[PDB]
Enzyme design. Structure first.
Site, PDB file in Angstrom:
ATOM      1  N   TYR A   1       0.567  -1.287   0.045  1.00 38.25           N
ATOM      2  CA  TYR A   1       0.160  -0.124  -0.195  1.00 38.25           C
ATOM      3  C   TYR A   1       0.812   1.270   0.017  1.00 38.25           C
ATOM      4  O   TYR A   1       0.137   2.241  -0.293  1.00 38.25           O
ATOM      5  CB  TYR A   1      -0.990   0.064   1.231  1.00 38.25           C
ATOM      6  CG  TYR A   1      -2.082  -0.947   1.084  1.00 38.25           C
ATOM      7  CD1 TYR A   1      -2.079  -2.137   1.370  1.00 38.25           C
ATOM      8  CD2 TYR A   1      -3.352  -0.501   0.536  1.00 38.25           C
ATOM      9  CE1 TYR A   1      -3.055  -3.113   1.174  1.00 38.25           C
ATOM     10  CE2 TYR A   1      -4.412  -1.452   0.547  1.00 38.25           C
ATOM     11  CZ  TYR A   1      -4.233  -2.673   0.791  1.00 38.25           C
ATOM     12  OH  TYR A   1      -5.369  -3.686   0.591  1.00 38.25           O
TER      13      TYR A   1
ATOM     14  N   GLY B   1       2.450   3.681  -1.697  1.00 42.86           N
ATOM     15  CA  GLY B   1       2.504   4.389  -3.163  1.00 42.86           C
ATOM     16  C   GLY B   1       1.214   4.587  -3.471  1.00 42.86           C
ATOM     17  O   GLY B   1       0.256   4.637  -2.519  1.00 42.86           O
TER      18      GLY B   1
ATOM     19  N   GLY C   1      -2.128   4.271  -4.148  1.00 47.35           N
ATOM     20  CA  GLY C   1      -3.033   2.976  -4.075  1.00 47.35           C
ATOM     21  C   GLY C   1      -2.542   1.618  -3.575  1.00 47.35           C
ATOM     22  O   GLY C   1      -1.333   1.723  -3.301  1.00 47.35           O
TER      23      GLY C   1
ATOM     24  N   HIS D   1      -4.064   5.120   5.390  1.00 52.14           N
ATOM     25  CA  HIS D   1      -4.081   6.610   4.759  1.00 52.14           C
ATOM     26  C   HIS D   1      -4.831   6.557   3.557  1.00 52.14           C
ATOM     27  O   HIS D   1      -5.755   7.582   3.345  1.00 52.14           O
ATOM     28  CB  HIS D   1      -2.757   6.912   4.305  1.00 52.14           C
ATOM     29  CG  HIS D   1      -2.512   8.189   3.402  1.00 52.14           C
ATOM     30  ND1 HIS D   1      -2.121   8.221   1.983  1.00 52.14           N
ATOM     31  CD2 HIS D   1      -2.777   9.469   3.836  1.00 52.14           C
ATOM     32  CE1 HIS D   1      -2.239   9.645   1.876  1.00 52.14           C
ATOM     33  NE2 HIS D   1      -2.313  10.276   2.823  1.00 52.14           N
ATOM     34  N   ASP D   2      -5.186   5.528   2.937  1.00 50.13           N
ATOM     35  CA  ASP D   2      -5.787   5.477   1.670  1.00 50.13           C
ATOM     36  C   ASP D   2      -7.211   5.571   1.984  1.00 50.13           C
ATOM     37  O   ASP D   2      -8.058   5.966   1.372  1.00 50.13           O
ATOM     38  CB  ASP D   2      -5.590   4.044   0.708  1.00 50.13           C
ATOM     39  CG  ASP D   2      -6.239   4.155  -0.293  1.00 50.13           C
ATOM     40  OD1 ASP D   2      -7.280   3.522  -0.680  1.00 50.13           O
ATOM     41  OD2 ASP D   2      -5.780   4.720  -1.581  1.00 50.13           O
TER      42      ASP D   2
ATOM     43  N   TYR E   1      -8.412   8.771   2.789  1.00 44.65           N
ATOM     44  CA  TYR E   1      -8.777   9.478   1.729  1.00 44.65           C
ATOM     45  C   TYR E   1     -10.224   9.192   1.050  1.00 44.65           C
ATOM     46  O   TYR E   1     -10.934   9.945   0.367  1.00 44.65           O
ATOM     47  CB  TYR E   1      -7.737   9.408   0.390  1.00 44.65           C
ATOM     48  CG  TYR E   1      -6.652  10.297   0.483  1.00 44.65           C
ATOM     49  CD1 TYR E   1      -6.213  10.866   1.521  1.00 44.65           C
ATOM     50  CD2 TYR E   1      -5.822  10.406  -0.743  1.00 44.65           C
ATOM     51  CE1 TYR E   1      -5.048  11.674   1.581  1.00 44.65           C
ATOM     52  CE2 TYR E   1      -4.645  10.969  -0.736  1.00 44.65           C
ATOM     53  CZ  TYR E   1      -4.225  11.656   0.322  1.00 44.65           C
ATOM     54  OH  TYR E   1      -3.206  12.711   0.381  1.00 44.65           O
TER      55      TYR E   1
ATOM     56  N   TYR F   1      -3.447  22.381   0.274  1.00 46.65           N
ATOM     57  CA  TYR F   1      -4.019  22.756   1.786  1.00 46.65           C
ATOM     58  C   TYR F   1      -2.814  23.425   2.227  1.00 46.65           C
ATOM     59  O   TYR F   1      -1.675  23.722   1.618  1.00 46.65           O
ATOM     60  CB  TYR F   1      -4.360  21.635   2.715  1.00 46.65           C
ATOM     61  CG  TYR F   1      -3.343  20.584   2.730  1.00 46.65           C
ATOM     62  CD1 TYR F   1      -1.957  20.749   3.502  1.00 46.65           C
ATOM     63  CD2 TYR F   1      -3.666  19.341   2.364  1.00 46.65           C
ATOM     64  CE1 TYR F   1      -1.246  19.914   3.623  1.00 46.65           C
ATOM     65  CE2 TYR F   1      -2.730  18.375   2.519  1.00 46.65           C
ATOM     66  CZ  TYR F   1      -1.209  18.467   3.262  1.00 46.65           C
ATOM     67  OH  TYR F   1      -0.387  17.575   3.089  1.00 46.65           O
TER      68      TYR F   1
ATOM     69  N   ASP G   1      -2.955  13.089   5.714  1.00 42.46           N
ATOM     70  CA  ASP G   1      -1.576  13.234   5.589  1.00 42.46           C
ATOM     71  C   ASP G   1      -0.683  13.244   6.892  1.00 42.46           C
ATOM     72  O   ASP G   1       0.329  12.654   7.137  1.00 42.46           O
ATOM     73  CB  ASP G   1      -1.231  14.359   4.474  1.00 42.46           C
ATOM     74  CG  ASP G   1      -1.633  14.042   3.091  1.00 42.46           C
ATOM     75  OD1 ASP G   1      -2.465  13.139   2.909  1.00 42.46           O
ATOM     76  OD2 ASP G   1      -1.396  15.107   2.408  1.00 42.46           O
TER      77      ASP G   1
HETATM   78 CA    CA Z   1      -1.382   3.734  -1.475  1.00 44.78          CA
HETATM   79 CA    CA Z   2      -7.274  24.193  -1.907  1.00 43.02          CA
END
Ligand code: CA
Ligand code: CA
Ligand code: CL
EC number: 3.1.1.4
Length: 131
Positions: free
Chosen positions: A28, A30, A32, A48-49, A52, A73, A99
């Site tokens: 994982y 990288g 996706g 993390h994925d 998202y 951001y 992140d």
């Molecule tokens: Ca990934």
């Molecule tokens: Ca923005």
């Protein structure tokens, strides 16, 4: 934004090179991933994925049809410590936090160099365990 995420990693782990180190690692770490995470650091990347994924379900993010990988951001780094600007909009703030959580998780996880550049076709085929 992806480049920002890598900056967050450099912040928390000054002793590393985000791209060479945390990209193409396990199943994982990288862009996706698939299969069952190979280890703790790999689990960080899976999480993390899924973070998202959660972001895309937020009301604000939905309406923006925001892309976590390209949504920029505001953040600042201070002695290994990451801070997501409280002036980011709710969607941007959730993405930055994803992140931030990831970078911190990386910094805590043990690094296993033999998990680098695994053959996704012979170690990661299948579906994610969560999300
Ligand atoms: Ca990934
Ligand atoms: Ca923005
Ligand atoms: Cl999906």
């Amino acid at each position: 934004a992806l480049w920002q995420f890598r900056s967050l990693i450099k912040c928390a782990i000054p002793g590393s090179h985000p791209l060479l180190d945390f990209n193409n690692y396990g199943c994982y770490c990288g862009l996706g991933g698939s299969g069952t995470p190979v280890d703790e650091l790999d689990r960080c990347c899976e999480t993390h994925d899924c973070c998202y994924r959660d972001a895309k379900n937020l009301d604000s993010c939905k309406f923006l049809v925001d892309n976590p990988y390209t949504e920029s951001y505001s953040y600042s780094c201070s002695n290994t410590e990451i801070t997501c600007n409280s002036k980011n909009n709710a969607c941007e703030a959730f993405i930055c936090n994803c992140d931030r959580n990831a970078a911190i998780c990386f910094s805590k996880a043990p690094y296993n160099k033999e998990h680098k550049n695994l053959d996704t076709k012979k170690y990661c085929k299948g579906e994610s365990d969560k999300c």
